[PDB]
Structures are given as C-alpha cells and as structure tokens.
Design a protein around this nucleic acid. Structure first.
Lengths: 63, 63, 63, 63, 63, 63
DNA sequence: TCCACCGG
DNA sequence: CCGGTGGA
C-alpha cells in the first residue's frame, strides 16, 4: 500500500521487465521521497548496491 | 527460523561479510534442501540471478 | 606477528607495491590457512570485496 | 572517539550499509576537517583510492 | 645494459610508440624474468599499476 | 633535493597516498615553477599524460 | 553521463 | 555471455 509517485516508478520498472529486489522496496518505504525523480534515483542507487553485493565472491574453506 | 544446514551456509556468508537479499532467503525456505552443498549452490545461483537483474538497464521516459 | 606463509604472500604484494587494506589483514589472521596458494586466493577474494564495496555509490539527500 | 561532523557522515555511510575500510578512518582522524562537506569529499576521495588500489593486478611468478 | 629478451620486448613497445615509465624499468631489472612472455606479462601488469595510480584523485585542502 | 613549494605539493600527494612516477619528478625539476598552484597543475597534467600512455594498447607478434 | 567495443 | 574500459 504505497505512495502514488512510488507506484508510478515501480511500474516503469515493470514496463522494462525488471524485478526490483524486496529489500529495496522495504528501504524505499521508510523514506517518503517526494518527486518521481527522487524515487528513480534512490532505486537506481540501490540496484547498484545489490549488483555489487551479489558479485562479491564467496571464500570457500569447505566447497 | 531455519534448518541446521541452512544456518550453516548463511553463517559462511556472514563470516565473509556478504548480505544475502531477502528474496533469496524466501525462495530458500520453500525448498528444504538436504545438504549444505545444495543450499550453497542454490544461493549462488540466486546471487547470479540478481546480479544480472540489478544490472538490467532501465528505459526512462524521464530523468 | 603471523604465519610464515602469510608473510610469504604479503611480501609478494609488497614487491608489486600494492597496499593491502588492513581489514583484509584482520580477516586473514582469523583463518589459519595452510598453503600459500590458499592465502593468496583468500586475499584476492578480499580485494574484489573491497573493490566492490568502495564502488557503492552514496545517496545524497543533503549535498 | 571522534568529531561531531565526522560522526554525522560515517552514519550516512552506515545508513547506506557501506563499510568504510579502516585505513580510511585512520586517515580521516589525521585532518580534523571542519564541515561535513569536507569530510564527505575527503572520504569519497579515499574510496576511489582503494577501489583503484584493490583493482591493481598482482604479478604471479609462482602459482 | 639489459637482458636480451628484456631488450626484445621493450623494442616491441617502441614500434607501438609507447613510453614505459622509468619506474617500471627499475622494477623490471630486479627480477631477471626468463622468457619474453613473462617480461611482457610483468610489464603489462606494471602499466595497469600506473594507469591506476595516476588516476587516483588528489584531495585539495587549499587549492 | 628541491624547491620548498615543490616539496609542499609533493607532500600533498603523500598525505593522499599517491606515488608520483619518477619521470614526473624529473621533468618537474627542469622547470623551476614558482607557486604551488603552478607545480600541482603541472604534476596533474603529467599524471594524465601517463594515465593515457600506460593505457595505450600493445600490438603483440607474441600473444 | 551514456553508448559502444574488446577482453576474460 | 558478462563484465570492464574507453570514447563521444
């Protein structure tokens, strides 16, 4: 149950067939960003964060 | 609340300071995988998925 | 004050003039790895870790 | 045990879930900068330092 | 006054009109690498080292 | 051994942990530049030249 | 800042 | 096929 401008942008991403991680949605709520511009920039930043987090290589001492 | 061999692998990622997105944990529980080997393969596959997903490039009608 | 093979690899890095972040050194002690191979792989993972971390873009809400 | 603005900025990075390597902290105590604006710029510069350092490729004479 | 394979590769570099910084030449003499392959490999690494190092950004406390 | 301003700017680069190639130091001394502003501009210019040089790509009759 | 090209 | 680097 989200803000209108939050909904605007999220569907933009749906339109590009991109699932947005749910950690990003959670982070998005606790911010009440006010333009669509800010939402898009916030989300874009978070996608980078998790592109990078997911690339992190796991050391294996077991394997 | 989770399976012993699941908690084993998640703590590997902690030790390596890696955040696992929560969508992955979600999908992980609805699988009851049996060994640590399997759990780890699954998680890895999912990190690739999301690395790719967070990489996908948005088409903007605005910016 | 460290294991001899640890030292062995840390000096390779020094010969190539690459500073190792000290967090890597921390994590490295907590693992008593046994071959020089293992130490190097471990260290190399950790470099990617922090190449990536340091690449994370900060969200500017105040600039 | 640090300056107020130092603390202001480091929690920025914490609210964005970004680890600051501890060599950066070291290097930051050593300058008593006086606005957040300078702290932030200083830290960003050091993140680039280490993104780049960590990217340096090691020459292997052994493997 | 250098090794014959060393001379061999540097000349390659000349034909492509490429200046090798002289710190590389230094680091090169302290390694007596044996094949041309290893020379080229070492030099190539050292090129990346200084491409990166020269990229690092300066923090300016006065300008 | 060098002019005080030369020295002032060189320590800027150290407090940023940046090695200056020694070909830069060389060219630097044969110019006696006067303000620190002039010195830094020079070094920077020179850092670009060599970022660029060290990037130029080798044509290999090896490979 | 975004787009295209080359390398692993 | 994906990731990184360089050029417009």
């Amino acid at each position: 149950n989200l803000s209108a401008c939050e909904v605007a942008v999220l569907d933009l991403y749906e339109q590009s067939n991109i699932r947005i991680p749910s950690d990003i949605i959670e982070d998005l709520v606790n911010q009440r960003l006010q333009s669509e511009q800010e939402v898009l920039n916030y989300i874009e930043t978070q996608r980078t964060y998790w592109k990078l987090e997911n690339q992190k290589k796991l050391y294996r001492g077991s394997l």
